[PDB]
Structures are given as structure tokens and as C-alpha cells.
From a paper:
Dual-specificity phosphatase 1 (DUSP1), also known as MAP kinase phosphatase 1 (MKP-1), is composed of a kinase-binding domain (KBD) and a catalytic domain (CD). To investigate whether these MBP-specific DARPins can also help to promote the crystallization of MBP fusion proteins, we tested the two MBP-specific DARPins off7 and mbp3_16 (DARPin 16) in concert with MBP fused to cata­lytically inactive DUSP1 CD (Cys258Ser). For the first time, we have demonstrated that high-affinity MBP-binding DARPins can be employed to facilitate the crystallization of an MBP fusion protein. The DUSP fold is virtually identical in all of the structures of the DUSP1 CD, indicating that the presence of MBP and the MBP-binding proteins did not distort its structure.
The maltose-free or ‘open’ form of the MBP-DUSP1 CD fusion protein was crystallized in complex with DARPin off7, while both the maltose-free and maltose-bound or ‘closed’ forms of the fusion protein were crystallized in complex with DARPin 16, yielding a total of three different crystal structures. The crystals of the DARPin 16 complexes contain one heterodimer per asymmetric unit in both crystal forms, whereas the crystals of MBP-DUSP1 CD in complex with DARPin off7 contain two heterodimers per asymmetric unit that are related by twofold noncrystallographic symmetry. Relative to the conformation of MBP, the orientation of the DUSP1 CD in the DARPin off7 complex is very different to that in the DARPin 16 complexes. DARPin off7 has three (N3C) and DARPin 16 has two (N2C) designed ankyrin repeats inserted between the same N- and C-terminal capping repeats. In the MBP-DUSP1 CD–DARPin off7 complex, the side chain of Ala83 in MBP is projected into the hydrophobic pocket formed by Asn124, Pro126, Glu131 and Leu135 in a symmetry-related MBP. The presence of a much larger and charged lysine side chain in the place of Ala83, as exists in wild-type MBP, would have negatively influenced the crystal packing. The crystal structures described in this report reveal that the binding sites for the two DARPins overlap extensively. The interactions between these six key residues and MBP are predominantly hydrophobic in nature.
Residue numbers in the entry:
A (entry chain B): 13 to 167
B (entry chain A): 2 to 512
The structure:
């Protein structure tokens, strides 16, 4: 199965394998049983060139897995700033919400990623969005001790 | 084969049966009573067979939880060791060999899961579960991961689910209340939720099983694993610089792993009960007796206080005993089988996002307490996916055919039952009534061949009950309220979701 090999090559950072697997016909939007696509795994694992190559070959930039995560969610949670920027440039919904109603801004706020937060705000991130616990990105930055971030989000 | 003046002992083949025979040899030198140690295959299943005829060994060594059933069948002698002897063993191990308020075996050894960590990747192992996400992010940046353990088997995830308040069956006095299940309370929910969040955030992969986690830890790819004493040998061979320690806390409370207590019971058919008492109390359960067994193959932590204090100088054995004492004794009742299957499904379903944590645990709570399949009509039975996985239980009912009312549950025995699949979900969107005629036709075709149909769904509550109600209405030309009252009389917990009930009422207008 080329699809499963493409998922693992994207997770593992094997640039040449990703390209050769697709040249052999692997579906760029292959998904496992939970809706996880290669673009999800490259964004989680921080492999920028693979992200770019998958997008160039038509990967869904806004594919959402069974928990409602898009690649933008994973890149923001895992702190990969350049991948965050590349996904937005390719049409990623800055305000995509997972099944807990969390947006990429909520997830970058958890870890205090200032630069990712600034990029998301510049692209229209909704500072009023509340997750299912009634929390805004600001609330989350408060509850995780990210004072410098909370100063910026205090509108 | 059982004769006065002689002792026959059964112990499993992976225990130190040669060390035990040494003890039996010393018993014979001191008393004239000869002791024969045997390790037959499947001895835990032979024993209830040979013992019901009044035969078998004098003494049987096995994990305590199998002994609750033996004691129900009246196969184990009741023991009454003096208070001074009872004080030699940790009190919680005596609770493991209690059945209906009477002692039915001697506790020998003590086993539970611990946290195992790689001192090179992780010199400062975490004290809390809450630390693991941040620990994982820092290790992922170097190509490693924080934690891998077997997520397929609920035995390995239960310590986290139980930490904040989950429990199997509530234990009060000396009896488990099989109608009081604690898999759906707030502590259980809080623990499963934390586990599922680790998976959706990619700190763990829901597909990791026993061998994947073992290979990863033993090759230096993950900093921690969760495992028991049976795994140490392979870690030693791998030469990883490891330590064994207390499981992390969750919400400030200890993880609560289940405890297995290797136990020695006396056959109720034995004519040598006093000799068995003398052997067990005066020779085996002493520093010398356990040591001879332990020198052959290690027991792990032991129930004898004086020898455990010696063995716990090994910090791995100290960690096993410490985790065991914060954990819970494995319940010794036969309802554990349905419990384990119920929880195993909930964790798999919640980890894969197929169900929310609340729905997954609500189903597990029902199934953990459920009886067997329920007879609706002599050829039509109602139950759960658990029942559908027990071939001998179905065969005992004379089931020849199954209706699997689910999207994902597989048909396990396609050479032994006729299957019909009704692939609908239990939600307000599913059009189950478009399957009524096909389901009804299938039941009639089984009935006309003299067969029996078992209709099941995940919880045996909504989807499968809807199919049985549809069959009764069409076949007996009765209304939903009559069919519904009939089935609630055989299993009051049935409850089609209200959209399914609406389709049933619309179905009655057409019959």
C-alpha cells in the first residue's frame, strides 16, 4: 500500500521517499482510519519541504482528522512557525475549530508561541473564539502562565 | 491419584517449580511425607475438572483471581491461619484470597505494573502524568518520544483511568457488587480524557501494542514505558540503562494498577489438609522456602513481610510492591471477562475518535454489568457485541445466526454462524427502518430452518432492540407499545434512541 508508506515517509521526514512514492502513484490525500493525511503528519513533525511538496501536488490544506484537527492545528500546537505560514498562504482556515471548539490560536496560546500567535492574528484569527470550556485564547494564555502572551492578547 | 500420607502440588511451568520441589524435599526429610511437584499444561483448567470428581493435586498455585470461581464451585478448602501467622503477610494480600468472607488460599507473590524509564534519555523521570506532553515535545525535537506502552489492552491503561476515581466493581465487606460499576464516573472520565488528548495531540499513537512499545523502549527510541516484571529480562538483554519507579500521579493521585497475587490453595477433596497447612505455613511461607523458589525463578515482590524487606533492596522489586500497594487487587469474580472486554472497546473507540469519551464509557458501564444474551422468543435472542465474540456461549444457547447491527463490528465466525449485517449508527440521522424488511426476512429464513438468531449491537440497548421490536410488531401484528412492553419485561434497559422509536411508530402505521 503506497498510501500507508506515504504517511510514514511524511511522518519520518523522508523527502525523497515522499516524492518517489507520489511518482509511483501514492495518493497525496491518503488517509488512515482516523482521517490522518500526510500533510497532517508532516506538519506535526515539522518537515517544511515535505509540507510544500505535498501542497504543490494538491494535498487538502484543510483536511480534518477524526478529532477535528487540520494541519494548521498541529503546526501551531507543535510550534512550527514556517509551516504555519506556508499553510495560511495555501488557504488554510485560520479559524478552523476542532471538536473541542479550539482554534489554532488556542493551541499556540497553550505553549506561548508569540510569533505563531502574531502570524495567526495578522491573518484574522478570532480572539473572541471560545472553546467548549468557555475559554478564549487569552484565557488559555493566562491559565498556562504565558504573561508576555497574555499582555498582547488583552485586546 | 490423591492418597493419604502424600502431597501432590501443581504449579505453572513459568514458576520456580524446581525450587519448590527442593522445599518439598526438605519437608519429606523432616516428616516422612513425600512431596511431588508437577507443572501440567493448562493446569488452571484441568484442576476444576479433576477436583469435582474428588481427585487432583493437594495444593494448586495460581493467580488469586482464578480462585474466586474455584471457591464458588466449592473446590477450595477454607483456611484459618492463626493471627500470628496472618501478621507475617501484608494485610492487603489476604484480601486477594477472600471469597464470600472466608480465606481460601495463602498469598505467595505480588505483581503489578511499574514505570520503566531510560536513564540516558531521561535522567529526571516525571512524577505526574500532566508533565508528559511538555516532556514529549522536548524529546520529539531530538527524534525521541516520551512514552510508549501497550494501548490495546485495558490492563495497561486502567492505572490512569482508575487514578482519579475509576473502579471495576465496588467492593464492600468481602463481596463485589456486580451491579455497581465505576467505569463511567467523573474520575474514570477524567483519566480517559487525558489519555485520548495525548493521542490526538500526537504524543502517543493509538495503534501502539505490546511488541511495538517493547521494541521502541528496548532500542532507545522512547524514554519511558509501562510494564511489569515479566518484561525485565528482555530489557536486560537489550542493555538499556533503565530504572523502575512509581507510576506517575494524575490529578495528584497515584495511578492504581491491578494487582495479581500468586496464591496456594488447598484442594477441598484433599485428605491431607493438615499436612498441606504444615507444608505451606511451616516450610514454604518462610524466608528459606520462598528463597529456594526465588533462586530458581524470581517471584518478584512477595507477600511475606520479612522476605520482601530483603528482596526490595532491588529497587525494581521495591517499585513493584509500591505500585501494588497504591493499586487495587484484581477482582476474583467471573464478571471480570465482560468488564475487560467492555473497557477494552471503550478505550479503543475513544482513542480512535469513533466515540466520545463519555459515550464510550457509558457503553462500557452497561456491558460490564450485563448478563448473558436475553431470550425474546425461543428463536430470537438479544445482546451485545461481547456475546457475539464468545463462540461457546452462543453455541450453548443453540445460536445458529447473528444479526450484527453496527457499522464497524466484525463477524468473528463466518464458518460457524450465518451472518446478516445492518450497518447503521446509533444516532438521530440513521435510517434503520430501511433495513426492517431485510432483517425480518433473515430472521424468518433462520426460523424456517429451525435455527436461532442472536441480534446484537454495541450495548444491546438501542440498535439491536429496535430490530427485535420491528420483528415482533410485523410478525405478531402488534403495536409498538405492546412489543416494547414485552421486551422491557425481558431486559428493562432497552431504549431505542427517540428517532428510532419514531421510525418504529411509523413502521406500525404500515403493518
Amino acid at each position: 500500500d503506497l498510501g500507508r508508506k506515504l504517511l510514514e515517509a511524511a511522518r519520518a521526514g523522508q523527502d525523497d521517499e515522499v516524492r518517489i512514492l507520489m511518482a509511483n502513484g501514492a495518493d497525496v490525500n491518503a488517509a488512515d482510519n482516523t482521517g490522518t493525511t500526510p500533510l497532517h503528519l508532516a506538519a506535526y513533525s515539522g518537515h517544511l519541504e515535505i509540507v510544500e511538496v505535498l501542497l504543490k501536488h494538491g494535498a487538502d490544506v484543510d483536511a480534518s482528522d477524526v478529532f477535528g484537527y487540520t494541519p494548521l492545528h498541529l503546526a501551531a500546537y507543535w510550534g512550527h512557525l514556517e509551516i504555519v505560514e506556508v499553510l495560511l498562504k495555501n488557504g488554510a482556515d485560520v479559524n478552523a475549530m476542532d471538536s473541542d471548539g479550539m482554534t489554532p490560536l488556542h493551541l499556540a496560546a497553550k505553549w506561548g508561541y508569540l510569533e505563531i500567535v502574531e502570524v495567526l492574528l495578522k491573518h484574522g484569527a478570532d480572539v473572541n473564539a471560545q472553546d467548549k470550556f468557555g475559554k478564549t485564547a487569552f484565557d488559555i494564555s493566562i491559565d498556562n502562565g504565558n504573561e508576555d502572551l497574555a499582555e498582547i492578547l488583552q485586546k | 491419584k490423591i492418597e493419604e500420607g502424600k502431597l501432590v502440588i501443581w504449579i505453572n511451568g513459568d514458576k520456580g517449580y524446581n525450587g519448590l520441589a527442593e522445599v518439598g524435599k526438605k519437608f519429606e526429610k523432616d516428616t516422612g511425607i513425600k512431596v511431588t511437584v508437577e507443572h501440567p499444561d493448562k493446569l488452571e483448567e484441568k484442576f476444576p475438572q479433576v477436583a469435582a470428581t474428588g481427585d487432583g493435586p493437594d495444593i494448586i498455585f495460581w493467580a488469586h483471581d482464578r480462585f474466586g470461581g474455584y471457591a464458588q464451585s466449592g473446590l477450595l478448602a477454607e483456611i484459618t491461619p492463626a493471627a500470628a501467622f496472618q501478621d507475617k503477610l501484608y494485610p492487603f494480600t489476604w484480601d486477594a484470597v477472600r471469597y464470600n468472607g472466608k480465606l481460601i488460599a495463602y498469598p505467595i507473590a505480588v505483581e503489578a505494573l511499574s514505570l520503566i524509564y531510560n536513564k540516558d534519555l531521561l535522567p529526571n523521570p516525571p512524577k505526574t502524568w500532566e508533565e508528559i506532553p511538555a516532556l514529549d515535545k522536548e524529546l520529539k525535537a531530538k527524534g525521541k518520544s516520551a512514552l510508549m506502552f501497550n494501548l490495546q489492552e485495558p490492563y495497561f491503561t486502567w492505572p490512569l483511568i482508575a487514578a482519579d476515581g475509576g473502579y471495576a466493581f465496588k467492593y464492600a465487606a468481602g463481596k463485589y457488587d456486580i451491579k455497581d460499576v465505576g467505569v463511567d464516573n467523573a474520575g474514570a472520565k477524567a483519566g480517559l480524557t487525558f489519555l485520548v488528548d495525548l493521542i490526538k495531540n500526537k504524543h502517543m499513537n493509538a495503534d501502539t501494542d505490546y511488541s511495538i512499545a517493547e521494541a521502541a523502549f528496548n532500542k532507545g527510541e522512547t524514554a519511558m514505558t509501562i510494564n511489569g516484571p515479566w518484561a525485565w529480562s528482555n530489557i536486560d538483554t537489550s542493555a538499556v540503562n533503565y530504572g523502575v519507579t512509581v507510576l506517575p500521579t494524575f490529578k495528584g493521585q497515584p495511578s492504581k494498577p491491578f494487582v495479581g497475587v500468586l496464591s496456594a490453595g488447598i484442594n477441598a477433596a484433599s485428605p491431607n489438609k493438615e499436612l498441606a497447612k504444615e507444608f505451606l505455613e511451616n516450610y514454604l511461607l518462610t524466608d528459606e522456602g520462598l528463597e529456594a523458589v526465588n533462586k530458581d525463578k524470581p517471584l518478584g515482590a512477595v507477600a511475606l513481610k520479612s522476605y520482601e524487606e530483603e528482596l526490595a533492596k532491588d529497587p525494581r522489586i521495591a517499585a513493584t510492591m509500591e505500585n501494588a500497594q497504591k493499586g487495587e487487587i484484581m477482582p476474583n469474580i467471573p464478571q471480570m471477562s465482560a468488564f475487560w472486554y467492555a473497557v477494552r472497546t471503550a478505550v479503543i473507540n475513544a482513542a480512535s475518535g469513533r466515540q466520545t469519551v463519555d459515550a464510550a464509557l457509558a457503553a462500557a458501564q452497561t456491558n460490564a454489568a450485563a448478563g448473558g444474551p436475553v431470550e425474546i422468543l425461543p428463536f430470537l435472542y438479544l445482546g451485545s457485541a461481547y456475546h457475539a465474540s464468545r463462540k461457546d456461549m452462543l453455541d450453548a444457547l443453540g445460536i445458529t445466526a447473528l444479526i450484527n447491527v453496527s457499522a464497524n463490528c466484525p463477524n468473528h465466525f463466518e464458518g460457524h454462524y450465518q451472518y446478516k449485517s445492518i450497518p447503521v449508527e446509533d444516532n438521530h440521522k440513521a435510517d434503520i427502518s430501511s433495513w426492517f424488511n431485510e432483517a425480518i426476512d433473515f430472521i424468518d429464513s433462520i426460523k424456517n430452518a429451525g435455527g436461532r438468531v442472536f441480534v446484537h449491537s454495541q450495548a444491546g440497548i438501542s440498535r439491536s432492540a429496535t430490530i427485535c421490536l420491528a420483528y415482533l410488531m410485523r410478525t405478531n401484528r402488534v403495536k409498538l407499545d405492546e412489543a416494547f412492553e414485552f421486551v422491557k419485561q425481558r431486559r428493562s434497559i432497552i431504549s431505542p434512541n427517540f428517532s428510532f422509536m419514531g421510525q418504529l411508530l411509523q413502521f406500525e402505521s404500515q403493518v
